[PDB]
Amino acid sequence: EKVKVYLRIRPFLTSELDRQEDQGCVCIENTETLVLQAPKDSFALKSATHKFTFSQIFGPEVGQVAFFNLTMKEMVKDVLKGQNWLIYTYGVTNSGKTYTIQGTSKDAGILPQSLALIFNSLQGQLHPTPDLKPLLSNEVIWLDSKQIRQEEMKKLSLLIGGLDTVPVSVPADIRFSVWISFFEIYNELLYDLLEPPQTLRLCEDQNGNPYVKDLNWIHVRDVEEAWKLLKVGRKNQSFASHSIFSIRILHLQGEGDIVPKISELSLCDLAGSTSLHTLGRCIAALRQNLIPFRDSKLTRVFQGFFTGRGRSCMIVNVNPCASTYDETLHAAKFSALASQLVH
C-alpha cells in the first residue's frame, strides 16, 4: 500500500483505429488487472499474454476532472493539511502523459487542477509579504528588504519571458505562503528551469538531508503566476530528461507568536525508455519494509520520500496501439505491483 500505481489508458484516435492499431493488445480485465497481448496481425514480418497488477486502472472513457478526483484530489487535500506528496509520471510515445500532466486550455491536466484547488482553498488566507522562504522541506529563512526586492526582480524577469473546482477545507487561524521550484535532470546533471534564458549542486543539510543548492523558489500569489512559471519552465526545457516541479506551502499558525510548518506537492516527469532502474529498486524496497537511494541523483533528490518524510505514488500513461506494444510491455514491467505470464 506504500507506492500506489495508477494506470491511465489513452483513448483510440479515429486515424489510428483505421491503421489497424486496435488488435486487443491493451485490455482491462478488472479495476486492478491489465492484460497485455502481442498483436494479432504483426506490423513486423513474423510467423505472448501478460497479466499486470496496478492500484487502479482508468480506462479511455475517464475524463480529466474524473481522473483528478479519483487520484490527485485527496493528495492535494493531504498537502493542504500538512503532509508531503510526490507523484511520479510515466509515458514514452503518444501515451497521453502531457494531456494528463498539463492538458489543453479547457481539458486542464492534473498539474493546473492542483494549482487551482490550492489557491481556491487558500483564498483570503494568504500571507502577503514573501517574508519567509521554505528553502528546505523542514526549514525557513527570513528575507530582508534587499532580498525580497531581488527575489521580486527574478520573478518579474520570468513572468515577462525576458527580452470551477470546489475548494478543500483549511483552518481559519492559519496564514499561507505558496512557493514553486522547477528543475530538470539531464544526464545526471541538474538544471534550473525558472532561470531567464549552468548546473546546480546537490548538498547535504545541517541535519544530513540532501537539497538542491541555489535552486530558485519563486513566491506565487495566484494560479495565473504559477501557470505562467510552468509555461516559462517548459519553454526553457524546449530551448535546451526528468522534469521535477515542486509546490511548497508554508503554514503560519496563530496570532502574535507564530508556529511555522512546511508541506510539499512534487511532480516528477520521468523520461521514457539506469536512474529509472534505481528508482524501480528504490520503490520495491520502500514497498517491502535499506533503500539504495544514493545509487542515483534522482533518488537522492527525493531521499525524504524513501526515509518516511513524505508519501509517493506513480501515474503511468499508456498508448493502446499495437505498434507501441513493446513500449507498453516495458512500462508495465517497470511500474506494475505484480506480473504474471499466462501459460
Residue numbers in the entry: 62 to 108, 116 to 231, 286 to 319, 326 to 368, 379 to 411, 431 to 446, 455 to 508
Manuscript text:
Among the kinesin classes, Kin-6 motor domains are unique in having long N- and C-terminal extensions as well as a particular long sequence inserted within loop L6. We also provide, for the first time, a detailed description of unique sequence differences and their consequences for the structure and function of this atypical kinesin by solving high resolution structures of the nucleotide-free (NF) state of KIF20A, bound and unbound to a microtubule, using cryo-electron microscopy (cryo-EM) and X-ray diffraction, respectively.
We obtained a 2.7 Å resolution structure of a microtubule-unbound murine KIF20A fragment (residues 55–510) comprising the MD and the first residues of the NL. Overall, the MD structure displays a typical kinesin fold with the MD in the open conformation, which is generally not observed for isolated kinesins. Instead, this open conformation is one of the conformations observed when kinesins are bound to a microtubule or tubulin. Close to the P-loop, a sulfate ion is found at the position normally occupied by the nucleotide β-phosphate. (c) The open NBS of KIF20A MD alone (X-ray structure) showing disordered switch loops. The difference is due to a bias in the β6-L10-β7 conformation in the X-ray structure that is involved in crystal packing contacts. The common interactions between L6-N and MD core residues are particularly well defined in the crystal structure, showing multiple hydrophobic contacts, especially in the βL6-βL6′ region (bottom). We also found that addition of 5–10 mM Mg2+·ADP did not disrupt the possibility to crystallize KIF20A in the same conformation. No nucleotide density or ordering of the NBS was visible in the electron density maps in this case.
